[PDB]
Each structure stands twice: as C-alpha cells, then as structure tokens.
Amino acid sequence: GVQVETISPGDGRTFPKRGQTCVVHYTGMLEDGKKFDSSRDRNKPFKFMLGKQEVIRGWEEGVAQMSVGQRAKLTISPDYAYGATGHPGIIPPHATLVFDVELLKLE
Ligand SMILES: CO[C@H]1C[C@@H]2CC[C@@H](C)[C@@](O)(O2)C(=O)C(=O)N2CCCC[C@H]2C(=O)O[C@H]([C@H](C)C[C@@H]2CC[C@@H](O)[C@H](OC)C2)CC(=O)[C@H](C)/C=C(\C)[C@@H](OC)[C@@H](OC)C(=O)[C@H](C)C[C@H](C)/C=C/C=C/C=C/1C
C-alpha cells in the first residue's frame, strides 16, 4: 500500500478533489538505496491531475490525503508502484519506493 508520514503540516482543510491539478515538488529514492529523481534540482515543480491515471497508484492515494502546504514522506510498496516488471533502466523489479512530497498548490 502507501504509508504517509508528515514532515511539515498543511492547513488540514484544503484537500485535492478528483480532476484538480496538484502542483508538487518531490524527491524519489529507492528504499535504503539510491536517489533517482528530484524536481527540486530542476528548479521546476511537477503537475498532474488527480484521478486521470497519470501517476502510480501510491501517488494517487497518497497525495489525495494531503492538505495544501503539507510535506510528507510516502512509502510505497511495489504493487502500488512498478510491481514485478519495474521501470526499465531506472527502477528494478519488486522495488519499494520512498518519496519526499510537498503539496505546493491546487489549480
Ligand atoms: C522526464 O520526467 C518524467 C518523469 C520521470 C519518469 C521516470 C520515473 C522513475 C520518475 O523519475 O519520473 C519518477 O520519479 C516517478 O516515479 N514518478 C514521477 C512523479 C510522479 C510519480 C511517478 C510516476 O507515476 O511516473 C510516471 C511513470 C513513469 C508512468 C508509468 C508509465 C507506464 C505504466 O505502465 C506505469 O505503471 C506502473 C506508470 C510518469 C508521469 O508522472 C507522467 C506525468 C505521465 C506519463 C508519461 C503518462 O501517464 C501514464 C502519459 O501517457 C500518455 C500522460 O498522460 C502524460 C501526462 C502526457 C504528457 C504529454 C507527458 C508528460 C511527461 C512527463 C514526464 C516526466 C515529468
């Protein structure tokens, strides 16, 4: 599944709804391993639409329980991430992923 652990609290009131654009900064890391991606390094936030199957299941259910301004550690099991096949050349089979996610704004 997905485990959400708060780093910094949000407003505890403004949660994304299905169909909204979430604007986030993230850092992705293989559990007890190597960092693979970060939007912070690129000085440019990532945007996606909740409920439109644009991101892995762990992100869909993880970000949905976050309020605006919240920063949280998301721990995602393989079946909620890339599963048995992984992501070719980057993510191995059966990888547990950890993400540092901050919810910047909704659009
Ligand atoms: C160069 O950076 C790209 C993302 C990279 C790609 C490799 C990943 C290991 C890496 O590092 O992020 C991650 O950190 C990662 O795991 N992410 C990105 C952050 C959100 C969560 C997750 C994810 O779901 O990635 C995904 C991941 C690589 C998608 C996999 C695609 C193949 C499926 O079988 C997988 O099943 C488990 C999910 C990519 C995106 O977040 C991306 C916005 C969506 C894409 C490419 C597709 O949606 C599934 C696409 O399909 C036509 C769209 O609808 C898309 C919104 C259309 C526009 C034109 C494309 C935008 C492309 C954006 C791509 C990026 C920002």
Side-chain angles (χ1 to χ4, degrees):
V2 62
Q3 192 189 326
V4 186
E5 289 168 286
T6 294
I7 302 159
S8 289
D11 69 14
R13 280 154 181 255
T14 320
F15 295 80
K17 78 175 182 175
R18 226 79 83 193
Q20 277 186 302
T21 299
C22 309
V23 181
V24 306
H25 268 307
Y26 73 92
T27 295
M29 170 187 162
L30 301 163
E31 194 198 37
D32 304 325
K34 216 164 276 189
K35 170 196 162 296
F36 56 84
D37 202 10
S38 181
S39 62
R40 306 261 193 176
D41 290 351
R42 290 188 300 271
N43 299 296
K44 204 197 88 167
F46 173 77
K47 301 182 189 182
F48 72 105
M49 274 187 283
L50 197 72
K52 320 291 269 199
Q53 290 189 300
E54 293 175 357
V55 293
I56 52 160
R57 195 180 167 178
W59 266 60
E60 289 267 39
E61 291 172 32
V63 184
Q65 47 184 290
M66 290 176 63
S67 57
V68 176
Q70 195 177 340
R71 189 175 169 175
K73 180 196 166 184
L74 278 57
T75 306
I76 306 161
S77 72
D79 59 308
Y80 271 60
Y82 295 90
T85 57
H87 190 72
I90 319 169
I91 306 297
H94 201 253
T96 290
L97 308 177
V98 307
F99 283 89
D100 181 329
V101 181
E102 192 185 354
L103 180 59
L104 302 164
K105 73 148 159 175
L106 295 166
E107 291 183 332

